[PDB]
Amino acid sequence: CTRPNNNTRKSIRIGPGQAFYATGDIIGDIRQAHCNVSKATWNETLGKVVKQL
Amino acid sequence: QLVQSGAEMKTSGSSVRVSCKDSGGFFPYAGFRWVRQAPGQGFEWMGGVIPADGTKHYAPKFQARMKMTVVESSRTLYMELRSLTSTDTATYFCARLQCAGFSCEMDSGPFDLWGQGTQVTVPS
Amino acid sequence: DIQMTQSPSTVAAFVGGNVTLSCRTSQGVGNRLAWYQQKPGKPPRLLISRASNRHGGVPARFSGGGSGTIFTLTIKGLQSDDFATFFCQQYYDSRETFGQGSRVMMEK
Ligand SMILES: *[C@@H]1O[C@H](CO)[C@@H](O[C@@H]2O[C@H](CO)[C@@H](O[C@@H]3O[C@H](CO)[C@@H](O)[C@H](O)[C@@H]3O)[C@H](O)[C@H]2NC(C)=O)[C@H](O)[C@H]1NC(C)=O
Ligand SMILES: *[C@@H]1O[C@H](CO)[C@@H](O[C@@H]2O[C@H](CO)[C@@H](O[C@@H]3O[C@H](CO)[C@@H](O)[C@H](O)[C@@H]3O)[C@H](O)[C@H]2NC(C)=O)[C@H](O)[C@H]1NC(C)=O
Ligand SMILES: *[C@@H]1O[C@H](CO)[C@@H](O[C@@H]2O[C@H](CO)[C@@H](O[C@@H]3O[C@H](CO)[C@@H](O)[C@H](O)[C@@H]3O)[C@H](O)[C@H]2NC(C)=O)[C@H](O)[C@H]1NC(C)=O
Ligand SMILES: *[C@@H]1O[C@H](CO)[C@@H](O)[C@H](O)[C@H]1NC(C)=O
Ligand SMILES: *[C@@H]1O[C@H](CO)[C@@H](O)[C@H](O)[C@H]1NC(C)=O
Ligand SMILES: *[C@@H]1O[C@H](CO)[C@@H](O)[C@H](O)[C@H]1NC(C)=O
C-alpha cells in the first residue's frame, strides 16, 4: 500500500501554545493512493480457501 | 532570535559541538536546519530537525560523522561533528524555515531566520 | 540531487545601475526558488520566495523572475547597500541546496 503524493506540513497556531498541523502544499503532481496484491498468489489462496469451504 | 556558541578552534580528529538556542519559542512550531559555509564559497546542507515530531534528517555526506540533538528544557539544538578534518573549517549556521504570520513551515521552505555563525577552524 | 549553477559570478556594477543575475538549476523546481543576500560577516538575508514574491523589508528595486529551470534576479536602481553575495536556493526536493554565490563589486 502506497500514497504517492508528497505532502508538506505547515503548523498553524490556534491558541496560546497549541498548534494545528495542517498540510501546506503538495509537491509535484497528485496521484491516487492504492494497494497491490499479486493476482497469482491471491487467486491461489482464494482457491485454497474455497477448497476448505 | 537564534543565537549560537562562540567561534571555536579544534584539532584534526577531535569532535566539535555547536549549539543553537532560539529565544522566542518557535520550537514546537517550525523546523530548523543546519548549514555550514566553507570560507567564501556558497553553502552546504548539513541537517534538519523538526523538534515537534523529533525527526532528524542528515545529509548523506555528514550522515555518519555528525549527530544532532534537541533539548526542550533549555530550547537548544546541538550539532556534534565527530571526525573533524582540515576541510571541515567553515562558518556553521542554524536556520529556521519560513513563517508567514502564525503558520510556520515544518518540512520544506526557504530559511528566513538565521543564526550569527560559529567559525570553526581546523588546520592540519 | 539538484545542482544550482549561478551564471554571472562577481559582476561589477556602479551605484544607480542595472544588474541582472541568473540561477540555472539542474532539474526543474517549478517555482520553489528563493534568493538570499549575504554581506561578508552577517548571516544571509532572505529576499525573495517563490522566485518572484518579495518580502517585507526588501525594496521594490529587487525583482525575481523566470520559472522552470532558468531564474533571474534584477536589481534595477542600485544603491550602496546592495553590494553583497547573492545566493539562489531551490527548496523543491528533500534537501534544499544553495548556489555558489555571485558577488557584485563597486569598481566604477
Ligand atoms: C511488494 O513490494 C515488495 C518490495 O518490498 C516486492 O518484493 C520484491 O520484489 C522484487 C522483484 O520486483 C524482488 O527483487 C528480487 O531480487 C532478487 C535479488 O535480491 C533477484 O534474484 C530477483 O530476481 C528479484 O529481482 C525483491 O527481492 C522482493 N523483496 C522481497 C523482500 O521479497 C513485491 O513483489 C511487491 N508485491 C506486489 C504485489 O507489488
Ligand atoms: C511571541 O512574541 C514575542 C514578542 O513579539 C516574540 O519575542 C520577540 O520576537 C521579536 C521578533 O524577532 C524580537 O525582536 C527582535 O530583536 C532582535 C534583537 O534581539 C532584533 O535584531 C530583531 O530585528 C527583532 O527586532 C524580540 O527580541 C523577542 N522578544 C523576546 C524574545 O523576549 C516571540 O518570538 C514570539 N514567539 C512565538 C513562538 O511566536
Ligand atoms: C517529494 O516526493 C517526490 C517523489 O514524487 C520526490 O521527487 C523525487 O526525488 C528523488 C530524490 O529525492 C529524485 O531522484 C533523483 O532522480 C535523478 C534523476 O533525475 C537521479 O539522478 C538522482 O540520483 C535521484 O535518484 C526523483 O527524480 C524525484 N522525482 C521527480 C522529480 O519526479 C521529491 O524529492 C520529494 N520532495 C520532498 C520535499 O519531500
Ligand atoms: C503541470 O502542467 C504545467 C502546464 O504545462 C507544466 O508546466 C508543469 O510542468 C506540470 N507539472 C508537472 C509536475 O509535470
Ligand atoms: C485461479 O486458480 C484456479 C486453479 O488454481 C484456476 O482454475 C482459475 O482460473 C484461477 N483464476 C484466475 C483469475 O487466474
Ligand atoms: C535598466 O534597464 C531598464 C530596462 O530593462 C531601463 O528602463 C532603465 O533605464 C535601465 N537603467 C539604467 C540605469 O540603465
Side-chain angles (χ1 to χ4, degrees), chain C residues 88-107:
Chain C
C88 64
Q89 173 195 209
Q90 64 88 359
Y91 45 122
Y92 186 98
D93 79 318
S94 303
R95 53 186 66 91
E96 25 266 341
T97 71
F98 301 68
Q100 41 236 38
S102 88
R103 293 161 27 83
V104 276
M105 296 185 262
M106 194 52 246
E107 267 269 6

Side-chain angles (χ1 to χ4, degrees), chain B residues 60-79:
Chain B
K61 303 179 60 178
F62 326 85
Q63 157 69 92
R65 295 205 298 173
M66 73 181 257
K67 64 98 81 288
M68 39 193 176
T69 54
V70 297
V71 177
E72 310 87 322
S73 63
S74 56
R75 291 191 284 97
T76 313
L77 304 318
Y78 295 113
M79 206 274 303

Side-chain angles (χ1 to χ4, degrees), chain A residues 6-24:
Chain A
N6 200 346
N7 288 79
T8 286
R9 302 194 218 77
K10 154 245 269 276
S11 110
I12 307 178
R13 234 177 299 169
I14 67 185
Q18 55 182 14
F20 161 61
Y21 304 94
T23 290

Side-chain angles (χ1 to χ4, degrees), chain B residues 37 40 64:
Chain B
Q37 172 164 28

Side-chain angles (χ1 to χ4, degrees), chain A residues 39 43-44 47:
Chain A
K39 200 201 314 174
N43 181 73
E44 143 192 342

Side-chain angles (χ1 to χ4, degrees), chain B residues 33 37 42-43 45 57-58 60 93 98 108-112 114-116, chain C residues 32 34 36 38 43-44 46 49 55 87 89 91 94-96 98-100:
Chain B
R33 296 287 143 83
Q37 172 164 28
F43 283 95
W45 209 80
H57 186 304
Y58 311 98
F93 296 87
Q98 194 193 15
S108 123
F111 310 156
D112 81 322
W114 293 79
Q116 80 264 357
Chain C
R32 320 251 295 172
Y36 292 80
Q38 180 182 36
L46 171 67
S49 287
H55 272 46
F87 306 100
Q89 173 195 209
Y91 45 122
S94 303
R95 53 186 66 91
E96 25 266 341
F98 301 68
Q100 41 236 38

